[PDB]
Design a protein around this ligand. Structure first.
Ligand SMILES: Nc1ncnc2c1ncn2[C@@H]1O[C@H](CSCC[C@H](N)C(=O)O)[C@@H](O)[C@H]1O
Ligand SMILES: COc1ccc(C(N)=O)c[n+]1C
Length: 258
């Protein structure tokens, strides 16, 4: 069996998720080490590499913004999407600078440092808030992930830690890659970062399924789905034993063949 989609609407607590994985505490936890590596990869893709354009769609954003910090320097507009309405509400609390919003300042500061300290935290945060115009529902398992909502074909589709959680099997994972491709313009970029060989992840006592994929199956599915791989990186760093049973993480950049 595998976690049903509806479980994300009801049982995925966005504040608990942020507390458990993104607090970015002084302790050199496995979670903070992964967060740092993700940030470095995202900086390399968006600011160092030529990954830019008018529109980036972030798929399965959850309640997080860390994956958009470097992207807001390179894209006029960023659209954040998720299957969960609760997650999108928590994201909107940060976007609207509400009092109950999650404290992203340690991560924001870290991203500013990476980029050369050209700007400081508040200026960086304001650039992200200005870039995010739409907060949409999405279902990666559907041929139209965004439903009846129309969007121009995007220059880039980004998905961090979403596809392993949303796809119950390898054929569904390959179809989800094809479905994301429907949102991309020909030659547009696909950026995926996710756990390798992970069959579950936890949010406190709440268990969530994950599709356990190795690097070869991820690369094969991306090629089967109609992309060409630009680069593929595997990091050996895994989450704490209490959080997930992954054997590292991967990051890839691919281009949609027309
Ligand atoms: N079918 C589906 N379509 C879209 N999003 C889905 C989905 N099934 C699960 N999700 C979402 O996938 C996310 C996994 S958590 C990942 C959040 C964030 N991108 C990060 O990097 O931390 C959750 O927000 C969940 O709601
Ligand atoms: C931190 O969020 C994580 C961590 C690990 C996994 C997994 N697929 O093992 C999934 N998520 C969403």
């Amino acid at each position: 069996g595998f976690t049903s989609k509806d479980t994300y609407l009801s049982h995925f607590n966005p504040r608990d998720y942020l507390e458990k994985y993104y607090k970015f505490g002084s302790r050199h936890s496995a979670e903070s080490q992964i967060l740092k590596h993700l940030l470095k990869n995202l900086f390399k893709i968006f600011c160092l590499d030529g990954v830019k354009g008018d529109l980036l769609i972030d798929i399965g954003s959850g309640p997080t913004i860390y994956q958009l910090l470097s992207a807001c320097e390179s894209f006029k507009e960023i659209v954040v999407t998720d299957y969960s309405d609760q997650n999108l509400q928590e994201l909107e609390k940060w976007l609207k600078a509400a009092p109950a919003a999650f404290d992203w300042s340690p991560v924001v500061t870290y991203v500013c440092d990476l980029e050369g300290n050209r700007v400081k935290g508040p200026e960086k945060e304001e650039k992200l808030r200005q870039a995010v115009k739409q907060v949409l529902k999405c279902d990666v398992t559907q041929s139209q992930p965004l439903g009846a909502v129309p969007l121009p074909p995007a220059d880039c589709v980004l998905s961090t830690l979403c596809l392993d959680a949303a796809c119950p099997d390898l054929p569904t994972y390959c179809r989800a890659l094809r479905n994301l491709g429907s949102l991309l313009k020909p030659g547009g970029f696909l950026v995926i970062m996710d756990a390798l060989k992970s069959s579950y992840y936890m949010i406190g006592e709440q268990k969530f399924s994950s599709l356990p994929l190795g690097r070869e199956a991820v690369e094969a599915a991306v090629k089967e789905a109609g992309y060409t791989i630009e680069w593929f990186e595997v990091i050996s760093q895994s989450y704490s034993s209490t959080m997930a049973n992954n054997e590292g993480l991967f990051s890839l950049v691919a281009r949609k063949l027309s």
